């Protein structure tokens, strides 16, 4: 594990730099952007907007983002490669399945799914040769039967390739606990795993208990807040009413309990969003005009001000991501 | 309408010839064929198999098929164009939504869906300029709230463009009655609509009533007979025990009641099938090795043998599809 695969090819571990580990260029659905690009204005408008945002994040110090859009989030790796080249920001692409698998995925065995993820990691996505650098999976509460198969196959693909696994959770339901049981049932090392959306909960005990076991804790929703828009139900349903400062203080809490090495921080931001209500992007961009730069422009200063040492901030934002993404065989 | 849109461009009504009105090159899911072509051996192997099949259907007299694969059936219009050109059979592509819409679709309003259907009809599918000549929709029992929006949008798209609508039904639940009610509420003329998989029912009067109202009746499951296959639960679950002869006899029943003009027949065949259990295709091909040629090779001769005249058979296989597919605006 001395090389990370990006959408422009392999980079060395030290080239990754300041890394956002849970982002998206566009959250959509399989086939959707190519079938109905006008939903986003145009594919050109979407790309131009992504490049603007990536250029601003780059200005703020971001060197790499991990796009955790799976097949069923409508990942378009050709778009990723395009905006990565235009903005000069490294993008790591994902394989895996999120919670909108179509029938041709849903009906598949753990063995078939394992071959699919391996294809995307080892040989390349679609016909592009672009290899995924991470595996994304998801539950929303107790795993469905198919979701158990997805997590087992993600564990098998990770063991075979060294590529890490990262999760969507409903944190309020402590999904991370079931996810960890399943992964461990496959012999996967907890240090290969990031339990994501974990700042959606204030149950610190749930969080430290997982970190104690060696899991990475993805605090990737820091800017997600509907405060000031509580009368917009779709936004509050999506974003929650907890403030960004509250979410960021979980980072400090984890640090204070000794778990700085287990923390990964991100915005879970995006430049198009079709798998929710129309015009939701306009709401989100008003909520967080900084977009992906929110972590380096607002969160890191806030923590430093609350007394987090520069050294600890560099560890969380540079070191942990490098360790996590470096392909690492058991 | 003087022209029907195909994956190779417009054709004249008379070029359509013998037409199968409900078929697939490949039944899959959006994005799936491009992300995981090895599920079908390879894209090349799938294309080759579809070409051989299309070539044998062409040999048996099939001039045109309507591939009723929607976005969420994983329609790959470039693949349709490639196999159309290689086999030299006309293929009409479809717009619409079947019963596996992803979130980005499921969350859309009737107005948005209407715009998406119109895009695929008037401007072209994806970035290809290939325009759909039909709109496929689906219910499986009482329409879900999303399926109502889909049916309304299909009706609005058909009214605006003249292109017909064709449906998947659970026939045993009389889906066609609610589908019709919805289409009529939008002022769509029944002669624009085919109520599909209708040979799945034994209720002749459910069928004759719709035909009387002016609906086309899609008898497109003729070869789907899971006969001698209860050893295989997903296959007999897929297919059924009713014989192909019994299903074909529904064509004769509609003819006998005076509805030959309202009948469309097809195989609902396919060369790949990822939206089901693995290796279902081997099972299907062993059951019906004629494939899309089953209609011209087995069904048409059987009907003639049962006394159905040549002109009537020409009417059903050539004249009805031509009338159906030819873009027709209301008054
Ligand atoms: C692809 As998402 C809306 O779970 O960040
Ligand atoms: C796409 As089908 C299985 O309803 O013919
Ligand atoms: Co998520
Ligand atoms: Co995300
Ligand atoms: Co059907
Ligand atoms: Co069909």
Does A224 belong to an annotated binding site? Answer: no
- B125 CB near a chain A CB, below 8 Å? yes
Are the C-beta atoms of A220 and A268 separated by less than 8 Å? yes
Tell me if B112 and A278 make a contact (CB, 8 A cut-off). yes
**Cα separations in angstroms, B175 against A50, A111, B182, B226:** 45, 37, 11, 22
| Residues in contact with B7: Cβ distance below 8 Å, sequence separation at least 6, in sequence order | B77, B80, B81, B84, B91, B92, B93, B130
> Which pairing describes strands B3-6 and B9-12: parallel, antiparallel, or unpaired?
antiparallel
> Which residue is closest to B116 within chain A, CA to CA?
A36
Count of domains forming chain B: 1
Are the C-beta atoms of A105 and A71 separated by less than 8 Å? yes
Ligand 1 atom 4 nearest Cα: A168
| Closest ligand 2 atom, residue B73 Cα | 1
B247 token code pair: 């299903």
Q: Which domain holds residue A151?
A: 1-330
| CATH number of the domain to which A200 belongs | 3.20.20.140
> Which residue is closest to A104 within chain B, CA to CA?
B275
Tell me if A103 and B100 make a contact (CB, 8 A cut-off). yes
Strand ranges in B50-117 using DSSP code E only, listed in sequence order: 64-67, 90-92, 94-97
Does ligand 2 lie within 6 Å of residue B224's CB atom? Answer: no
Cα of A94 vs centre of ligand 1, distance in Å, is 13
**Cα separations in angstroms, A262 against A88, A207, A283:** 28, 10, 32
Q: Chain A: nearest CA to B43, how far in angstroms?
A: 11
Resolution of the experimental structure, in angstroms: 2.0
* DSSP code per residue over B135-166: EEEE-SSSPPHHHHHHHHHHHHHHHHH---EE
Q: Phi and psi at residue A245, in whole multiples of 5°?
A: -65, -40
**Cα separations in angstroms, B192 against A299, B86, B176, B230:** 59, 31, 14, 38
How many pairs of residues across A and B have Cβ atoms under 8 Å apart? Answer: 98
Cα of A27 vs centre of ligand 4, distance in Å, is 8
Torsion of CA B284, B286, B291, B296, to 10 degrees: -120
DSSP state of B123: I
Q: How far is CA B283 from the centre of its chain?
A: 21
Which candidate in B24, B32, B33, B35 is best for mutational testing of the A interface (most A CBs within 10 A)? B35
> Which pairing describes strands B216-219 and B263-265: parallel, antiparallel, or unpaired?
parallel
């Amino acid at each position: 594990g001395d090389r990370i695969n990006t959408v422009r090819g392999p980079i060395t571990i030290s080239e990754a730099g300041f890394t956002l580990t849970h982002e998206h260029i566009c959250a959509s659905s399989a086939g959707f952007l190519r079938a109905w690009p006008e939903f986003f204005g145009s594919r050109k408008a979407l790309a131009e907007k992504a490049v603007r945002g990536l250029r601003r994040a780059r200005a703020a110090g971001v060197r790499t983002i991990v796009d955790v859009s799976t097949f069923d989030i409508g990942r378009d790796v050709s778009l990723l490669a395009e905006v990565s080249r235009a903005a000069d920001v490294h993008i790591v692409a994902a394989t895996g399945l999120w919670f909108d698998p179509p029938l041709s995925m849903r009906l598949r065995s753990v063995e078939e799914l394992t071959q699919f993820f391996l294809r995307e990691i080892q040989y390349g996505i679609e016909d592009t040769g672009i290899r995924a650098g991470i595996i994304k999976v998801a539950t929303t509460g107790k795993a469905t039967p198919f979701q158990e198969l997805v997590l087992k196959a993600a564990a098998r693909a990770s063991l075979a390739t060294g590529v890490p696994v990262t999760t969507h959770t409903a944190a309020s339901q402590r999904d991370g606990e079931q996810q960890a049981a399943i992964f461990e049932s496959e012999g996967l090392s907890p240090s290969r795993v990031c339990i994501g959306h974990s700042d959606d909960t204030d149950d610190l005990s749930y969080l430290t208990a997982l970190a104690a076991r060696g899991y990475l804790i993805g605090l990737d929703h820091i800017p997600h807040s509907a405060i000031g828009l509580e009368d917009n139900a779709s936004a509050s349903a999506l974003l929650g009413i907890r403030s960004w400062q509250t979410r960021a203080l979980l980072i400090k809490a984890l640090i204070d309990q000794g778990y700085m090495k287990q923390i990964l921080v991100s915005n879970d931001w995006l430049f198009g969003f079709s798998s929710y209500v129309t015009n939701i992007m306009d709401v989100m961009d008003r909520v967080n005009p900084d977009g992906m730069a929110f972590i380096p422009l607002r969160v890191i200063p806030f923590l430093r001000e609350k007394g987090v040492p520069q050294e600890t901030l560099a560890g969380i934002t540079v070191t942990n991501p490098a360790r996590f993404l470096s392909p690492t065989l058991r």
